[PDB]
Design a protein around this motif. Structure first.
Motif, PDB file in Angstrom:
ATOM      1  N   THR A   1       2.802   7.440  -4.184  1.00  0.00           N
ATOM      2  CA  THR A   1       1.350   7.320  -4.311  1.00  0.00           C
ATOM      3  C   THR A   1       0.834   7.756  -5.679  1.00  0.00           C
ATOM      4  O   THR A   1      -0.341   8.113  -5.808  1.00  0.00           O
TER       5      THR A   1
ATOM      6  N   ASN B   1       0.816  -1.216   0.000  1.00  0.00           N
ATOM      7  CA  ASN B   1       0.000   0.000   0.000  1.00  0.00           C
ATOM      8  C   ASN B   1       0.850   1.266   0.000  1.00  0.00           C
ATOM      9  O   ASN B   1       1.729   1.412   0.857  1.00  0.00           O
TER      10      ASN B   1
ATOM     11  N   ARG C   1      -5.487   9.047  -5.292  1.00  0.00           N
ATOM     12  CA  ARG C   1      -4.067   8.823  -5.502  1.00  0.00           C
ATOM     13  C   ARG C   1      -3.496   9.911  -6.406  1.00  0.00           C
ATOM     14  O   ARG C   1      -4.224  10.680  -7.040  1.00  0.00           O
TER      15      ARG C   1
ATOM     16  N   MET D   1      -0.336   4.243   0.839  1.00  0.00           N
ATOM     17  CA  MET D   1      -0.772   5.113   1.930  1.00  0.00           C
ATOM     18  C   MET D   1      -0.044   4.806   3.232  1.00  0.00           C
ATOM     19  O   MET D   1       0.324   5.723   3.973  1.00  0.00           O
TER      20      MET D   1
ATOM     21  N   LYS E   1      -9.239  10.546  -0.479  1.00  0.00           N
ATOM     22  CA  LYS E   1      -7.833  10.165  -0.470  1.00  0.00           C
ATOM     23  C   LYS E   1      -7.396   9.683  -1.845  1.00  0.00           C
ATOM     24  O   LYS E   1      -6.724   8.658  -1.976  1.00  0.00           O
TER      25      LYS E   1
ATOM     26  N   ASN F   1      -9.271   4.135  -3.531  1.00  0.00           N
ATOM     27  CA  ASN F   1      -8.275   5.198  -3.551  1.00  0.00           C
ATOM     28  C   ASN F   1      -7.880   5.599  -2.139  1.00  0.00           C
ATOM     29  O   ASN F   1      -6.726   5.959  -1.889  1.00  0.00           O
ATOM     30  N   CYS F   2      -8.819   5.514  -1.193  1.00  0.00           N
ATOM     31  CA  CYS F   2      -8.483   5.773   0.201  1.00  0.00           C
ATOM     32  C   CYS F   2      -7.567   4.707   0.786  1.00  0.00           C
ATOM     33  O   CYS F   2      -7.103   4.862   1.921  1.00  0.00           O
ATOM     34  N   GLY F   3      -7.299   3.637   0.046  1.00  0.00           N
ATOM     35  CA  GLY F   3      -6.460   2.564   0.526  1.00  0.00           C
ATOM     36  C   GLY F   3      -7.170   1.527   1.361  1.00  0.00           C
ATOM     37  O   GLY F   3      -6.504   0.644   1.914  1.00  0.00           O
ATOM     38  N   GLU F   4      -8.490   1.603   1.470  1.00  0.00           N
ATOM     39  CA  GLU F   4      -9.263   0.694   2.297  1.00  0.00           C
ATOM     40  C   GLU F   4      -9.986  -0.320   1.411  1.00  0.00           C
ATOM     41  O   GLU F   4      -9.754  -0.400   0.201  1.00  0.00           O
TER      42      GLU F   4
END
Ligand SMILES: Nc1ncnc2c1ncn2[C@@H]1O[C@H](COP(=O)(O)OP(=O)(O)O)[C@@H](O)[C@H]1O
Ligand SMILES: Nc1ncnc2c1ncn2[C@@H]1O[C@H](COP(=O)(O)OP(=O)(O)O)[C@@H](O)[C@H]1O
Ligand SMILES: Nc1ncnc2c1ncn2[C@@H]1O[C@H](COP(=O)(O)OP(=O)(O)O)[C@@H](O)[C@H]1O
Ligand SMILES: [K+]
Ligand SMILES: [K+]
Ligand SMILES: [K+]
Ligand SMILES: [Mg+2]
Ligand SMILES: [Mg+2]
Ligand SMILES: [Mg+2]
Lengths: 525, 525, 525
Positions: free
Chosen positions: B515, B111, C35, B113, C33, C456-459
């Protein structure tokens, strides 16, 4: 544009290729019996030459890395000649050999800085040994004798050099000019020589000597920066008449004024030369006023509120001849009246008497010497024009080499004093085993000048160097006559300044060449 | 036109190729004994340099995305230097290390982030450790010592700096100018420093300093937007005479008037500079009136109905010297009469007494500081001109580094402070196994400055940094002298701001570097 | 010239290639968030962005047909944003998804019209469910909350906007302008907003806003067609003085006059803006007279037989500010005196009382509202100009989003509302197995906005959508803070108009190219 980037040895190999191409084409001419190089011209018969400088100027490499190596050797060899006065091919041999040895040590994967340290200490010790072997050339007899050797055993040139030495002092201002008939005239006139050269390269009109020469030129005595040509249109138009040149001596001449002056020069409208005023700040105006006094002009400054638009020929000083070198403007026989010059000399002499500062004392001594000692004027006499010009050039060359002889003495030429240094410095050891090899890099590569001399002569370099090694002091080998002996006796001298500068610049370029870890060049598109 | 659209690690690898080319060519010069990089010139002698900045300037990549990576990393290294004042090659090394480690972490399929989070938290804790190790440099003695160290062991520069901050305050305006002789003159005149630079880049006439400098310049005190050249032509015509520059200090100059002024500048008709009026809204006109008061001019505003067609030289303000930086116009010795200065100062001090708002209070304090604190003028005197200019440049450099030392203190230089930080942050853990990696990505770049320094010095970096670690506080390894010891003892210091900004911008470029999931550029046709 | 003719699915594959390239470059930035996308620049450090719009803009493909697909998919995403006020990346994701599976199903051989019918009925039922799920935002409390949320937690912006609707009505004309100090000033002046933009794109002087802004402009109130510049030269000559711009508010301007005016604009002689007169036929004359009274001008019509040759500044109307948008010209504080404004208001009000037609009376209420409600002026106050500008921009953004919320309510944000709609529409059955697949194509793309946001938030998009579905109503997941819960609680709101327009335009473009059986482009020579 996109850059072709190299790192370390990939740079070093191609730079050394340039080094070797330049030096191989150059060194075939080293010594009195150099070989022939036929440099092409786009038309007609080419030129067959036996001089390292001539071949060096015609060496260009299509590859940019090899071009960089060749150029960085070429400029440093030029530096060695400039700090030397001779030995351009000798310096080229020294540079190629020391650089090659240092780079080949580097390519083994070994410390560059230790090689630089070893070469540096070797060259320092070699300069010391050359100084020890250096026999001073300071009296008028050795001055004349070195003038002969540099003038190729031309005794009259040595006599002219020594006579100027006696007239204006050995530090005095000496100029050799054109004569009228067959008589060589040396005389001292009210002149000056201040370290200010041409502001723009396009003002030079004599490629033979590479100096700006003007006959009866007005000089611009302006103590301000030149920023607008509008200040110059009246002055330039006034100078345009009668076909007389103009000299610009001022604080600075800005870009557009220089461009307009240069345009007027090639277009043949007005011949004008521009140099910076000698000194700066407070000294610049005083020295410009000294120039005005010696040349009978008026200084134009914004402090007095004098404008260049209201500037006539009277404010401009006048001299019979003004010589502008690369970094030197010599005013010869300025029309400034003799009593005016002497009164100015006396006034700055009382300034000497009131000078309570050592720097003030020294600058005033320089000013009085320049203002009153004058310039040594040498006139070349001959039957026809060509021999007159060539003997003037020979006088220039012998003066240049005799000046180095005065400054630092002379050593046995032909590379045999360098053989003395190699023999004497066999004991030099460096702070690292990497430094040790750096020492022998400078040492053996320093007998190379003689070796290339003898090779070009067609004889054996090795036995010559070895037989010189058997000898001592100034014992050597006469390459032109192919006979050994002491070349104090057989008249082969290289001034200690010449060889010292050659070896020092070879060391400097070699050391810069050793620690070169990256390279950038443009793409060859 | 047709665009090259890429994504993710395919972008990242070309990015990293640019990063690594830049850093490899740059870092070989880091430290006191940087290695030689020979930069090609299209003609003549190439440039042999041992500075990372010079090599970075000549780094260009033909591919779009490699040049993309190189350009953004070069820009961030410039960011680190600018917020730093030093360590451009140090910042390049740090950025390369953190960028490479983060990108190789991303290309493993993990990742971005969390790498961002770990690197950010590591760099925050590292800034904390650097601050803790940072020793303040705010007293005059440490100020002088740091200015000496940054001026390469030059005390007189630090003494001049200390005298300037004693005269005008350490927050006051300090300027260095040319002197007349060999004396260093320090004096205070009536001037101001407002954060307004040149409006157009073509107005700069001194590439050596990169600032707009004019001798006795007229300033256009116009409190209106400049939209038509028809308003500007009489002003330019008036300025054209006497060869004096013009400054434009107004609200704004539109495109066509600025283009006309620029045309006039390179054509050399009139040298004119345009700068924005400091402040905005209501404070802009008040500060412009202050500029008029200190320069003895009149504010030309549409509110009072004053037009630039009827604008003569009298309405223009005058100063002895006006210096325009990138975002700062500094007026030095404005001809605004001293009693006028004191009257305006008294009026704004009354406004201080009448100030009921903290914002207005601080605006009045900064206005009084600019108007009455003046500027510190340091004249550099020398025997010649070149050493004069180099002393002036060294004064500027020591000023820049000493300002950072005052701002944030100093730390043990040579890369050993970052070694201290890395040793002290061995305890730092992230919020994830990934965030732990991000921390170690940032932390391990800390010894990289020292290691590259010592490697370039020709010495071993490894047990150098190891013995730094074994030492405590400021103990480290002297790179130039090839010795260990303490930076505070042997005098190798780096401002805390320098290293902090270098690390922070290395972190920021690493975070943006990690990123990025897409690309756009033009096709290479 | 020769044409490249292509049919059906071979066109649809190039479509979908452009579609997927565009959307894959766009959607990596969707969500709080998003990228990074380093948009490689021609020079210097490239542009790094986290916005789908920015990546969308530089998406161009060398092939005609791939660029083609990118072009209309970008077109439709922009359409959904414009009819939405937000969701360019959401619209891009939805368009790419529905286009992708629609084009694949067509390439599978299943009916284009039945795919279109199923997709259309799915999307209309989706709009139905989204409307049912929409909670209205009409109260000033919800208005302030939505403005705060869209301005990224800025309550001051919401309060200023709410005061604007309270002072001039929510249908009134609200304009935000530059402030003087730090005070947010709200006041009302006399103006109209009539749906008439600039005639030619070259008249725009603010690329940041894309609207024509003029400070104290003269307006040409010509109720006639403009064909010959010979009528226009005197007006331009009169306007050229005093450095003031001219607005052309006329019936029609032909090619020659418009081109001459445009040439005058880029040449910088006179700044000219041309806007069509609002209304047509009889109403155009009345509205132009209203504008004349607002600005204190005179209508120039061929019916009265008055020409533009004898048109001076008096006939031209004057306003403090006139804002000319793309299809809207807002006149702010027209110098038409207040009693004249009220007299015209009363005259149009009695015309209302005499109105016997619903269309006529509606136009009469439009005229009175525009003439008497005026234009709302909001000043943004800030200490610095840059923060002032960004606060003004955030005020505009919150204004647009709050207007959308008032228009169509709000839904739980983060992409959970489409998840609710997809859960509710699992029962939707079409007229065919094709229409059921057509239904399923639109139904499944509903969670794609949330999924891309969380990605995109990494979740984890899948668990996020699953926990949303497990929750009810506004239960969802905070993508930035990595938390679940009710979206109304965490202040994540998107206007129902945004999502509705995004999905509807996605369906429109998908069904359009689903029914495409031929295609031509030019040869790539
Ligand atoms: N007869 C000679 N015997 C030995 N060495 C000589 C003789 N003549 C000249 N030399 C040496 O050769 C060198 C001259 O080489 P040359 O080809 O002139 O190169 P450059 O023009 O660079 O000096 C001088 O340094 C000198 O010492
Ligand atoms: N004698 C020394 N011993 C240890 N470190 C040194 C010494 N001299 C300089 N340095 C370090 O080297 C760095 C200078 O590197 P430099 O080549 O100037 O890169 P930059 O130009 O980016 O600052 C400084 O940060 C300093 O701490
Ligand atoms: N903290 C959050 N949690 C969940 N969703 C969020 C959060 N912040 C923003 N969003 C969602 O992300 C979307 C923002 O996407 P954006 O990049 O603005 O696309 P566009 O520019 O096309 O509107 C909004 O629709 C919003 O619902
Ligand atoms: K020769
Ligand atoms: K260095
Ligand atoms: K985003
Ligand atoms: Mg010679
Ligand atoms: Mg440094
Ligand atoms: Mg959005």
């Amino acid at each position: 544009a996109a850059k072709d980037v190299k790192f370390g040895n990939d740079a070093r190999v191609k730079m050394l290729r340039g080094v070797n191409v330049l030096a191989d084409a150059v060194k075939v001419t080293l010594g009195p019996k150099g070989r022939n190089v036929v440099l092409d011209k786009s038309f007609g018969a080419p030129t067959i030459t036996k001089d390292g400088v001539s071949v060096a100027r015609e060496i260009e490499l299509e590859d940019k890395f090899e071009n960089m190596g060749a150029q960085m050797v070429k400029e440093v060899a030029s530096k060695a000649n400039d700090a030397a006065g001779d030995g351009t091919t000798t310096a080229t041999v020294l540079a190629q050999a020391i650089i090659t040895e240092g780079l080949k040590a580097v390519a083994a994967g070994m410390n560059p800085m230790d090689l630089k340290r070893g070469i540096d200490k070797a060259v320092t010790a070699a300069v010391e040994e050359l100084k020890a072997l250096s026999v001073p050339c300071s009296d008028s007899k050795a001055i004349a004798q070195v003038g002969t050797i540099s003038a190729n055993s031309d005794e009259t040139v040595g006599k002219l050099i020594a006579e100027a030495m006696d007239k204006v002092g050995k530090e005095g201002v000496i100029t050799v000019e054109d004569g009228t008939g067959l008589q060589d005239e040396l005389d001292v006139v009210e002149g000056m020589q201040f370290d200010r050269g041409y502001l723009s390269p396009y003002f030079i009109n004599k490629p033979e000597t590479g100096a700006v020469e003007l006959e009866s030129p007005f000089i611009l005595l302006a103590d301000k920066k030149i920023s607008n040509i509008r200040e110059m249109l009246p002055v330039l138009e006034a100078v345009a008449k009668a076909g007389k040149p103009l000299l610009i001596i001022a604080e600075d001449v800005e870009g557009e004024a220089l461009a307009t002056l240069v345009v007027n020069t090639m277009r043949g409208i007005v011949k004008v030369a521009a140099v910076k005023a000698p000194g700066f700040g407070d000294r610049r105006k005083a020295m410009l006023q000294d120039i005005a006094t010696l040349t009978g002009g008026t200084v134009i400054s914004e402090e007095i509120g004098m404008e260049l638009e209201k500037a006539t020929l009277e404010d401009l000083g006048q001299a019979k001849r003004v010589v502008i070198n690369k970094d030197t403007t010599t005013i010869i026989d300025g029309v400034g009246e003799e009593a005016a010059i002497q009164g100015r000399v006396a006034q700055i002499r009382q300034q000497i008497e009131e000078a309570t500062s050592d720097y003030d004392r020294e600058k005033l001594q320089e000013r009085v010497a320049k203002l009153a000692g004058g310039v040594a004027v040498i006139k070349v006499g001959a039957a026809t024009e060509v021999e007159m010009k060539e003997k003037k050039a020979r006088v220039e060359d012998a003066l240049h080499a005799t000046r180095a002889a005065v400054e630092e003495g002379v050593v046995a030429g032909g590379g045999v004093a360098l053989i003395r240094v190699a023999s004497k410095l066999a004991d030099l050891r460096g702070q690292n085993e990497d430094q040790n090899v750096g020492i022998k890099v400078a040492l053996r590569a320093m007998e190379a000048p003689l070796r290339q001399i003898v090779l070009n002569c067609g004889e054996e370099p090795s036995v010559v160097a070895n037989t010189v090694k058997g000898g001592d002091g100034n014992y050597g080998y006469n390459a032109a006559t192919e006979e050994y002996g002491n070349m104090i006796d057989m008249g082969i001298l290289d001034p200690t300044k010449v060889t010292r500068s050659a070896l020092q610049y070879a060391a400097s370029v070699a050391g810069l060449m050793i620690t070169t870890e990256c390279m950038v060049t443009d793409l060859p598109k």
